[PDB]
Amino acid sequence: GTVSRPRGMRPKWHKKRIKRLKLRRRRMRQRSK
Amino acid sequence: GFFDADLSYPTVRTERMKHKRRRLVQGPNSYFMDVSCPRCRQVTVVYSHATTSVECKGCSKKLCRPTGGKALLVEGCGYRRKPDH
Amino acid sequence: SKVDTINAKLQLVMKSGKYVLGTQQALTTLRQGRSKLVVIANNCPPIRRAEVEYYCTLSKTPIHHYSGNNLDLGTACGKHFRTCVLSVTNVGDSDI
């Protein structure tokens, strides 16, 4: 390892999970309006 | 024991090695020379770091060639350093 | 270094000499014998160019074949219009 404790999942994959979540939310609002 | 360097009056050896603008009082490195043309046989004053085309009045032959630093005098010509002042 | 020098002489002529712009005025100077130099753009029509060279040959007037077109020749003279032919009638301090 080259980093300290993440205290969570790997930050790159957490960022991707957030990115997919943002895409889903903006799609749901689009279908609503 | 040896002589301690004085900042206000540096020694000859210390001052001579310094860059012209790093001396205690800045000054030129260049000078002027009397050059006798090998073809015109005439005296012309030439800058030691001439970058332009210096030619003899008579022969119209180039008296020197520009370089990165000091100008190079053509073969045959005789040069004499003129006094700085 | 084909254009840089002649542009400098053109600037000196433009400042301290006497010149004429256009084929018709240039031909008039050649007929009068007052022309000292004729400059021709590279996009001059072949029949017009040949007429100018023939006039210059008869009058023994030097010709310079400019490396630019009429737009470049006008700009080199400091004008905002094109010129096919330039005739210098007084060289001024240019030495051209």
Binding site: - | P28, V45, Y47, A50, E55, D84 | A8, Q11, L12
Partner: protein
């Protein structure tokens, strides 16, 4: 050149002498030095070139030390000063040449970057000359 626009830290420059008196071997009169300055100017030479030729081939290290006047001052007094200041003229010429090259070479992004620096330098220089009234108001470099 050195420091503005490009983090160069070069120090090359002239080092003017402390003693300003013309050397004793220089027998040329001040009125003749003025004549050569005007004569060189009429041949189209810029003030920078005029000084270098006098320095290289006439033994005149400093026109000001010989005549009391700078070369540009002599030209201004004789009505031979350039319409555009020398440094502005050369910067404008470089910008025009670079634009001429870029007209064909549209992917020379380094030249485009250097052109931005040159034109920025021109506009700052123009601002100074208009302030000191060496340029007419409403002078504007046009790309």
């Amino acid at each position: 050149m050195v420091r503005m626009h490009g983090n160069g830290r070069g120090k090359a420059s002239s080092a003017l002498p402390y003693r300003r008196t013309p050397p004793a071997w220089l027998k040329i009169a001040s009125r003749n030095v003025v004549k050569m300055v005007c004569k060189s100017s009429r041949k189209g030479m810029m003030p920078s070139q005029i000084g270098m030729e006098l320095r290289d081939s006439m033994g005149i290290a400093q026109v000001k030390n010989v005549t009391g006047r700078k070369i540009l001052r002599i030209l201004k007094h004789n009505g031979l000063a350039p319409e555009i200041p020398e440094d502005l003229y050369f910067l404008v010429k470089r910008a025009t040449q670079m634009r001429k090259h870029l007209e064909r070479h549209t992917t020379d992004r380094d030249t485009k970057y250097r052109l931005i620096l040159v034109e920025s330098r021109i506009h700052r220089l123009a601002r100074y000359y208009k302030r000191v009234k060496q340029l007419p108001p409403t002078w504007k470099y046009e790309s």
